[PDB]
Amino acid sequence: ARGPKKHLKRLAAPHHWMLDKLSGCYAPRPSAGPHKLRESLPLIVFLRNRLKYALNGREVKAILMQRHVKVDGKVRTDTTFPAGFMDVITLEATNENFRLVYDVKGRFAVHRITDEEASYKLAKVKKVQLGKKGIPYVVTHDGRTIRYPDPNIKVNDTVKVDLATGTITDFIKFDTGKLVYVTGGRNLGRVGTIVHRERHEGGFDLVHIKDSLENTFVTRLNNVFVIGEPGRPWISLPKGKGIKLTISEERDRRRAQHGL
Amino acid sequence: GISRDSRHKRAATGAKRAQFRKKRKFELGRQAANTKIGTKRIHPVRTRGGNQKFRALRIETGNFSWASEGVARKTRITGVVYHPSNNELVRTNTLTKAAIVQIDATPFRQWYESHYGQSLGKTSKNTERKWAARAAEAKIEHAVDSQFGAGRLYAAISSRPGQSGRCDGYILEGEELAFYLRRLTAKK
């Protein structure tokens, strides 16, 4: 009905916002940005509901204004700016750097990171095409277009963007026996190896993934994000190395590592 | 206004559908331009998402392509002789797409002369040399040649003049041209 929608009801929000059912009718709708609405994570949520540096929206706004938050080197001032997967959130005071990565369960984890890694962003390849004047460009599944790419970078390949300038420093080819991260579905937040790649030339390629504990699962190709060569990831993965325990196992862990 | 909705239609079964929702602006369709010949007059229309289509009510000139030779020239359109959809259009002189029209042809003739030097109906040294290098390539379909003699070439419009404002096409060649001629003859 008539043009774009501008609000978001609290229940209609992505569940991995971890937003509480009460204390409001509305949720912070991610503005038009680099990442998809449902796959994003607004700055407000990151600030208030994760790190707890702000108490309310006004506080968040104030924080933003003094030009201190930095999403991928660039500044940002939107409360509802949609930082998503692999995005580096740097705070100038505190000197903390964060990379937005998922965890074993599904939601965005607070993952503290060093300045040596915070310099670069890792990004999947969505499209490879020749643009105007015959100039080749690559499209990252995370927002960007990069002109004149290395011509053996194809779709689904992951790319090390140096972020400070925005040039491709290095890349990983999508292939069997390469460390992978799942970014959508039930298996989202899981880390694996790629055992096999089914095709079905028509609709949705399925990739078979084994983790470190020899525990195979299948996801769609567009949910699968390459991260390195097995055992050696290009980024630091969060605590619990994207592993997925069974519920009982988790409970046991909780019990046996008690230290109140 | 004229709407392109499939709401007002009957279903596959022949069932008359009930009137759900009043007609929308995204369903809309505007009046026919039905362009005439003589003195250039082009009205812009604001479409969806900004953008302009150009209604070409009254057009005189047009640039037409000789696909064999590989050249196109701006030329006067003088009359619609045949239109596949409707004889009414022909009667009117309504310039549309796929209509068959008569072109001034003089520019084409001039071009030909410049190129080969052979002329249709009956200097420097470099030019002569060039001509020599060419030749025998200058033969053409007989029908075209005949037309040239009269001074008016048959061409088909391939632009949608109601959409672009631009009125453009291709000079009639080969089998298609022959077919068109036959059709014309039949009509007479």
Partner: protein
């Protein structure tokens, strides 16, 4: 248009109102544990029933099957914590045999009475 608040009816009335023996039993129970209403008793019964439903379901699933192993175990643990099940009977099969008295003999009422501090249940209440 704010997110709806969840209610839950926490008791269930009997399916037959004047079952005389049942009524007398209820009365006796009330007398024993200084209960203001039959409502309290009903609440307890409802609670018991919920537990039973869970337990039965668990039983219906194969033993050593994950869900049974987990949820059932958790339930058992909870029961032991509350003090309704005894350490002899961490079994899930024993969960079905519980009966209303064990819940009433665990209220801050009865407990208060049974540690001194009172002289009868009413006083404690």
């Amino acid at each position: 248009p704010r997110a709806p608040r969840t209610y839950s009816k926490t008791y269930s009335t009997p399916k037959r109102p004047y079952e005389s023996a049942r009524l007398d039993a209820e009365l006796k129970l009330a007398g024993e544990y200084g209960l203001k209403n039959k409502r309290e008793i009903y609440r307890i019964s409802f609670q018991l029933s919920k537990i039973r439903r869970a337990a039965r379901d668990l039983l219906t699933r194969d033993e050593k099957d994950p869900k049974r192993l987990f949820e059932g175990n958790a339930l058992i643990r909870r029961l032991v914590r509350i003090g309704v099940l005894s350490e002899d009977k961490k079994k899930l099969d024993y969960v079905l045999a519980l009966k209303v008295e064990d819940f009433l003999e665990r209220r801050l009422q009865t407990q208060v009475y049974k540690l001194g501090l009172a002289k009868s249940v009413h006083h404690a209440r």
